[PDB]
């Protein structure tokens, strides 16, 4: 007997596959954490030492990508007792999240990019995929290397920068500071091979998107690198958000904000407004002040259920659109060559199994792989 177990051959058979594109009943073959074949009727003996998983009657789709999570904890706005705890592995996986982007909020005094970076690396080791944004609400940005441009270019896991505008907790940044920061992230992304995006936490100020428009007139960063998040937090903002997307921008809807514009509602409206799903993303703001991750899946459910979306479409904002926006190669789509990050769900869209890089992380809706110190 020759041992071929090192390959981790796994054949996922019989599910209705949503790539996110609907592919009907189709098989998925994996090896070494990667999707090596996607086709109907793959032979169960095509490769030696194969784990065969019968998924007939179930749905198979890409794992979710949540680009807005306070991995190391957040909060602190009402004093020290309000600092939230770091996020546990199992909380992400049970919610269907296989790829995450960590960031900081208001507090960048007791919270540091170096800590965020360590946590990011820990999660990668524990089995999922993670990246981070440098900076925090504060502008000028507090970085690891002392320069936004340098953090993005040199720190492997950093893909862009975070900031806050139009919010009572911002640093009152002027146009020049915002432009220069955005431009540094853009340039750093080019040199490091990162999307080099600038993510804007939006608050309730009546100035709404104004600062972004101002920025665009004061620099040459492409519109496609600027991401306003929390856009559903207030009406005028949301509306302004729709115009910004119409101009070529991408907008991030927050799943944890249920009023005045609910997440599913926002997504539907955007589509009805003529914005392609490719320019609409959804994120949780998980572990902030603790917001959980269940609203992600719930949004999907609502879209299909109450908004006439097909399952395919409903998945885009959490899969292909994000991956596309952040240029996350090998993520968000079920194609040969991509990472084996997959969800197994019931036809009613309840999570049964989660695989990350080909490893079974959750079974029967329960994490079977946990963080190092998870209790």
> Where along the sequence are the contacts to Zn ion (CB under 5 A)?
105, 201, 285, 288
SS3 269: helix
Phi, psi of 347, deg, nearest 5: -65, -15
Candidate list 44, 57, 210, 222; residue touching a copy of itself; CB under 8 A = 222
> Before 230, cis peptide (omega within 30)?
no
Q: What is the chain's Cα-based Rg?
A: 20
Sequential DSSP letters for 161-192 = EEEEESSTTS----HHHHHHHHHHHHHHHHHH
Residue tagged active-site, from 66, 285, 339, 341:
285
193 contributes a contact to a copy of itself by CB under 8 A: yes
Q: Which does 285 bind (CB under 5 to 8 A by kind): a copy of itself, Zn ion, none?
A: Zn ion
For the chain, strand residue ranges (E) read 10-13, 16-18, 22-25, 27-31, 34-39, 51-54, 59-62, 64-69, 97-102, 129-135, 158-165, 197-202, 226-229, 251-254, 280-283, 342-345, 351-356, 359-363, 366-367
Candidate list 22, 51, 57, 109; residue touching a copy of itself; CB under 8 A = 109
19 contributes a contact to a copy of itself by CB under 8 A: no
Candidate list 94, 107, 265, 341; residue touching a copy of itself; CB under 8 A = 107
Which window, 38-46, 92-100, 272-280, 295-303, contacts a copy of itself (CB under 8 A)?
Answer: 38-46
Q: Which does 169 bind (CB under 5 to 8 A by kind): a copy of itself, Zn ion, none?
A: a copy of itself
273 contributes a contact to a copy of itself by CB under 8 A: no
24 contributes a contact to a copy of itself by CB under 8 A: no
Residue count at the site for a copy of itself (CB under 8 A)? 91
| Residues 366, 350: Cα–Cα separation, whole Å | 12
348 contributes a contact to a copy of itself by CB under 8 A: no
46 contributes a contact to a copy of itself by CB under 8 A: yes
Place of tokens 């029967």: 364
Q: Which does 288 bind (CB under 5 to 8 A by kind): Zn ion, a copy of itself, none?
A: Zn ion
Q: Is 285 a catalytic residue?
A: yes
Q: Which does 170 bind (CB under 5 to 8 A by kind): a copy of itself, Zn ion, none?
A: a copy of itself
For 55-96, strand residue ranges (E) read 59-62, 64-69
Candidate list 192, 317, 330, 332; residue touching a copy of itself; CB under 8 A = 192
Phi, psi of 99, deg, nearest 5: -135, 140
Catalytic residues, which ones?
285
């Amino acid at each position: 007997m020759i041992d071929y177990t090192a390959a981790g051959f796994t054949l996922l058979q019989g599910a209705h596959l949503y790539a996110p594109e609907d592919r009907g009943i189709c098989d998925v073959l994996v090896a070494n954490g990667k999707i090596i074949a996607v086709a109907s009727n793959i032979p169960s003996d095509i490769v030696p030492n194969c784990t065969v998983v019968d998924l007939s009657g179930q749905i198979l789709c890409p794992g979710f990508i949540d680009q807005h999570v306070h991995l190391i904890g957040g909060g602190g706005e009402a004093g020290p007792t309000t600092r939230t705890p770091e996020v546990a592995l199992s909380r992400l996986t049970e919610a269907g999240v296989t790829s995450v982007v960590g960031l900081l909020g208001t507090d960048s005094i007791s919270r540091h990019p170096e800590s965020l970076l360590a946590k990011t690396r820990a999660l990668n080791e524990e089995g999922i995929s993670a990246w981070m944004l440098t900076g925090a609400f504060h502008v000028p940005s507090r970085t690891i290397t002392g320069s936004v441009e340098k953090d993005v270019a040199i720190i492997d896991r950093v893909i862009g920068v975070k900031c806050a505008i139009s919010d009572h907790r911002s640093a009152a940044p002027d146009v020049y500071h915002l432009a220069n920061m955005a431009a540094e992230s853009r340039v750093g992304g080019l040199l490091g091979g990162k999307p080099g995006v600038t993510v804007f936490h939006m608050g309730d100020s009546k100035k709404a998107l104004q600062p972004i428009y101002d920025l665009l007139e004061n620099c040459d960063v492409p519109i496609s690198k600027l991401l306003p998040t929390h856009v559903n937090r207030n009406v005028p903002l949301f509306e302004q958000a729709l115009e910004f997307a119409r101009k070529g921008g991408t907008i991030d809807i927050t799943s944890s904000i249920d009023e005045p514009v609910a997440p599913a509602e926002g997504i539907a409206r955007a589509v009805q407004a003529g914005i392609p799903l490719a320019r609409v993303t959804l994120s949780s703001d998980g572990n902030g002040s603790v917001a959980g991750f269940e609203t992600l899946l719930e949004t999907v459910q609502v879209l299909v259920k109450d908004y006439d979306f097909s399952i395919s479409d409903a998945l885009r904002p959490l899969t292909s659109s994000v991956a596309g926006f952040l240029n996350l190669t090998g993520k968000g789509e079920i194609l040969p060559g991509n990472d084996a990050d997959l969800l197994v769900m019931t036809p009613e869209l309840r999570i049964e199994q989660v695989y990350a890089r080909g490893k079974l992380m959750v079974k029967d809706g329960k994490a079977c792989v946990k963080g190092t110190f998870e209790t």
